[PDB]
């Protein structure tokens with residue numbers, strides 16, 4: 001297991017966003033041409049084992065631990081009735097006090113805030129990716145497709161990402177092999193070597209959130225200089241077309257940087273290889 005390994009994302013120009021927005025309120029449009037310099041992206045979402053190495057090294061206490069609660073999806077025991085603030089829910093106890101990560105060391109770390117993610121990535125000699133880096137990487141060398149792999153949800157009748165099957169929120173059939181999270185190395189990689197870029201855990205990016213984008217061509221854009229929420233990408237194991245079609249690379253959502261939840265993690269990026 002090399003779950004802190006990075007892959008080289010090649011230099012290129014790509015179309016960020018879409019002129020066929022599916023969630024218009026989220027500023028998926030307009031499509032815009034963005035140039036990205038070559039850099040490195042973590043192949044995997046940061047796992048419990050990998051975060052535990054960080055915590056072991058630094059003593060870091062996450063914002064959820066200090067606040068004393070975090071958001072948990074009701075189905076596995078607020079922004080929606082199915083999100084409950086649970087006392088003692090944190091990265092070690094993802095559904096609250098009497099849950100554990102002992103049996104899921106290779107699953108993505110959860111209940112990590114934007115600040116927690118920055119702390120980890122910087123500790124690791126890395127950083128968060130920008131939204132544009134994240135989206136470019138998500139698209140995996142394909143142009144204007146819905147998903148990392150193309151436009152079909154189940155190409156060749158195969159599951160390609162961990163999202164919801166069944167009637168949300170009452171019934172998760174586990175058709176794709178996982179009701180909650182999957183191991184960070186589950187499912188096929190995309191064209192650049194990334195696993196679970198869409199689905200599984202949401203991923204923080206460095207950008208402040210806005211819904212107002214120009215069509216001007218940009219180079220290594222960093223997002224707006226100010227805001228109140230940071231951008232997160234890719235959707236999660238909770239997402240279903242019926243209520244939440246956010247497992248597309250162009251999709252985007254937000255949370256305040258001190259926020260944490262049972263479907264939200266991250267991966268790191270770097271300009272160059274670290275030690």
Ligand SMILES: *[C@@H]1O[C@H](CO)[C@@H](O[C@@H]2O[C@H](CO)[C@@H](O)[C@H](O)[C@H]2NC(C)=O)[C@H](O)[C@H]1NC(C)=O
Pocket residue numbers: 049050052053056
């Ligand atoms: C984080 O630190 C803990 C505590 O040191 C590690 O667990 C110990 O690891 C040693 C060495 O393999 C074992 O002999 C002990 O049995 C473990 N102690 C306990 C109380 O579990 C743990 O492996 C570290 N985590 C990571 C991801 O490196």
Ligand SMILES: [Sr+2]
Pocket residue numbers: 162163164165174175176177178179180237
């Ligand atoms: Sr699933």
Ligand SMILES: [Sr+2]
Pocket residue numbers: 045196197198199200201202203234235
């Ligand atoms: Sr993901």
